[PDB]
C-alpha cells in the first residue's frame, strides 16, 4: 500500500501535493442544503474544502468524508501543524484528498 | 464551491451573516420529544438554535445537524471565539446554517 | 421555538426545573442487559438518570439520548458546573429532559 | 430504576463489585478477528475486559458496549480515578458491566 | 480470553510484536477513493497502517477499524506514548492488529 502521502497521491488523476507546514488560520462548517461542507484557510492565502457527499461517492468514501471533517475541526482547535495536503487541483476550492501532520 | 462564509451564506435566501467575535455564554441541549435541539446565547443577549430535524432535510443534512451540535458543545467547552455566524432569519430563535472560527 | 430551558421545559407534562449550579459529584455508566443507562449525583444528595431507550420515546429522541450521555461524561470529566436541569419527575431517579450550562 | 452501581449490579447473576479507587495503568485495544475488545489493568494486577459483541448480548447492549470502550479510553488518557466496577465473574478476564467514578 | 497484547498477538497467524515505547512521529489520513486509510510513522523508522475495509473483515472488524483510526488520531495529536503494536507482517506497510499504552 502507499507508504507516504506523496506515494498515495501519485495514484490519482488530477492531484497535487501542497506543502503547507502551518496550523489552520480559519475554519468554516456549513450544514446548509447541498453545501454540507467544511472550508479551511491557511495564512498563505490557500483555501481548501472537504467536498460534499454525493452519489459519485462510493459508500466507504462517505465514511472517510466524515472523518476528514472531524480531523480538520480538532486540528484547528488544537492549533496543530498540517504538513502537506494532497488535493484534487481541478476543483474550486481544491478538494482535500489526504492530509499529513508531523512530529 | 464558496470560499468564505459570507460567500456561502450569500447563496441562500432568508439568511443573515452575524459577526459575533466572542465565546458562547450558554449551552442548552434537549432530548425532549419534538424539541431535540441545541440553543446557544452570547453575552450580547443574542440567542441562536440548531433546528429540530425537520422533514425538509436531506440525509446529508441529517448527519450535518449532528455535526453542528458536536461543534457547538466543544466550542462552548473550550471557550473558543466564534467569528461570524450565518443563520436563517425567518425562524425564532435564528437557526444556525453555517459557522466560522478565525485563528 | 423555546428560547430558554425554562420555556422549553414548560411546554411538557410532568417536568420540573432544578437549579443545580454545581458540577457532578459522581457518574455511573451501565451496559448491563436492559439497564443501559447513566446515573449522576450531586452533593446536595440529588440523583438523576438518563433513561434506558425504550417504549415511550420518539425515534428522534433515541439519537438525542445518546448525545445526552456523551455530554454528561465530558461535563463530569472537565468539572463544568450544570446550571439548570429540566427533569421528568414521574420516574425514579428523575430523568433528564434538557440541561443548561452558563459561561 | 436503580440509583447506585451496587443496586444495579445486584439484579444480575454472576456479577461482583470490585472497589478500585485508582486510575488505569494500561489500556490495550484490539481489532483482531473475533478478538475485537479492550483490556485494562490496574497496579494491583486486576485485569478486566469489555467483551466481544455477540449472541449473548441483546441488541441494545451492542451500542452501550461501544460507549463503554469510549469511556474507558478517555478515563485512561485523562488519569481519572475509577471508583467501582461491577464485573461478570463467570469469565476470565472478568467482563465489565458497569463503572462509577467520583470526585 | 488472553489477558495481554502478547497472548492476543500470539494466537494469530503472521503476527509480531513491536516494542515501541515512543510516540507517533507522523500521521497521514486519506479519504482518497479506494485508499481510505491511515498511516503512522515512528523515529525508529517503522511505517504501519490501518487497512482499508473490505472482505477480510468480518462486520465486527469494521467497527473496530474505525475505533483504531480514532485512537491513533487522538494519541498522535496529544503525543501519547504507545507501548507495543502487534501487527500482521505479511502486509506493506505492516498492518496494525492491536495497540497497548502503559501509564
Amino acid at each position: 500500500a502507499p507508504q507516504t502521502i506523496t506515494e498515495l497521491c501519485s495514484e490519482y488523476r488530477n492531484t497535487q501535493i501542497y506543502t503547507i507546514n502551518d496550523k489552520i488560520l480559519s475554519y468554516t462548517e456549513s450544514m446548509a442544503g447541498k453545501r454540507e461542507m467544511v472550508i479551511i484557510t491557511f495564512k498563505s492565502g490557500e483555501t481548501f474544502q472537504v467536498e460534499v457527499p454525493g452519489s459519485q461517492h462510493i459508500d466507504s468514501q462517505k465514511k472517510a468524508i466524515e472523518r476528514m471533517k472531524d480531523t480538520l475541526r480538532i486540528t484547528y482547535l488544537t492549533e496543530t501543524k498540517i504538513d502537506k495536503l494532497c488535493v484534487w487541483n481541478n476543483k474550486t476550492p481544491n478538494s482535500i484528498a489526504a492530509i499529513s501532520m508531523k512530529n | 464551491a464558496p470560499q468564505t462564509i459570507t460567500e456561502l451564506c450569500s447563496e441562500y435566501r432568508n439568511t443573515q451573516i452575524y459577526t459575533i467575535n466572542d465565546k458562547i455564554l450558554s449551552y442548552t441541549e434537549s432530548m425532549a420529544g419534538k424539541r431535540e435541539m441545541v440553543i446557544i446565547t452570547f453575552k450580547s443577549g443574542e440567542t441562536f438554535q440548531v433546528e429540530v430535524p425537520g422533514s425538509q432535510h436531506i440525509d446529508s443534512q441529517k448527519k450535518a445537524i449532528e455535526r453542528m451540535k458536536d461543534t457547538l458543545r466543544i466550542t462552548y467547552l473550550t471557550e473558543t471565539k466564534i467569528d461570524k455566524l450565518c443563520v436563517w432569519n425567518n425562524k425564532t430563535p435564528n437557526s444556525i446554517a453555517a459557522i466560522s472560527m478565525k485563528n | 421555538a423555546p428560547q430558554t430551558i425554562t420555556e422549553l421545559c414548560s411546554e411538557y407534562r410532568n417536568t420540573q426545573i432544578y437549579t443545580i449550579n454545581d458540577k457532578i459529584l459522581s457518574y455511573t455508566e451501565s451496559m448491563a442487559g436492559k439497564r443501559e443507562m447513566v446515573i449522576i449525583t450531586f452533593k446536595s444528595g440529588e440523583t438523576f438518570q438518563v433513561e434506558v431507550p425504550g417504549s415511550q420515546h420518539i425515534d428522534s429522541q433515541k439519537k438525542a439520548i445518546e448525545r445526552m450521555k456523551d455530554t454528561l461524561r465530558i461535563t463530569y470529566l472537565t468539572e463544568t458546573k450544570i446550571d439548570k436541569l429540566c427533569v421528568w419527575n414521574n420516574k425514579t431517579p428523575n430523568s433528564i429532559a434538557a440541561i443548561s450550562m452558563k459561561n | 430504576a436503580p440509583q447506585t452501581i451496587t443496586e444495579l449490579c445486584s439484579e444480575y447473576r454472576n456479577t461482583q463489585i470490585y472497589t478500585i479507587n485508582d486510575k488505569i495503568l494500561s489500556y490495550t485495544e484490539s481489532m483482531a478477528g473475533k478478538r475485537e475488545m479492550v483490556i485494562i489493568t490496574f497496579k494491583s494486577g486486576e485485569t478486566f475486559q469489555v467483551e466481544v459483541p455477540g449472541s449473548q448480548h441483546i441488541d441494545s447492549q451492542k451500542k452501550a458496549i461501544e460507549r463503554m470502550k469510549d469511556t474507558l479510553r478517555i478515563t485512561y488518557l485523562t488519569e481519572t480515578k475509577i471508583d467501582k466496577l461491577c464485573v461478570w465473574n463467570n469469565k476470565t478476564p472478568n467482563s465489565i458491566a458497569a463503572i462509577s467514578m467520583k470526585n | 480470553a488472553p489477558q495481554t497484547i502478547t497472548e492476543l498477538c500470539s494466537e494469530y497467524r503472521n503476527t509480531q510484536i513491536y516494542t515501541i515505547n515512543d510516540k507517533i512521529l507522523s500521521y497521514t489520513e486519506s479519504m482518497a477513493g479506494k485508499r481510505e486509510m491511515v498511516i503512522i510513522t515512528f523515529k525508529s523508522g517503522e511505517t504501519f497502517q490501518v487497512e482499508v475495509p473490505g472482505s477480510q473483515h468480518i462486520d465486527s472488524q469494521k467497527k473496530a477499524i474505525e475505533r483504531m483510526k480514532d485512537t491513533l488520531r487522538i494519541t498522535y495529536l496529544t503525543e501519547t506514548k504507545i507501548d507495543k503494536l502487534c501487527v500482521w507482517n505479511n502486509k506493506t506497510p505492516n498492518s496494525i492488529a492491536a495497540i497497548s499504552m502503559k501509564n
Partner: protein, 41 residues
C-alpha cells in the same frame, strides 16, 4: 471573628476550583472523540 480567616480560605479555594475546571476544559477536551450517533443507534 476567626470566621474572617475561615471565609478567606473558602472564597480563595472557590476561586481556585473555578480556575481548575477551566484548565480541565482546555486539556481534557483534547481527548474528546465524537461519535457517529447515526451508525450506532
Amino acid at each position: 471573628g476567626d470566621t474572617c480567616n475561615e471565609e478567606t480560605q473558602n472564597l480563595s479555594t472557590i476561586y481556585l476550583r473555578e480556575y481548575q475546571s477551566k484548565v480541565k476544559r482546555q486539556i481534557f477536551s483534547d481527548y474528546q472523540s465524537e461519535v457517529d450517533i447515526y451508525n450506532r443507534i
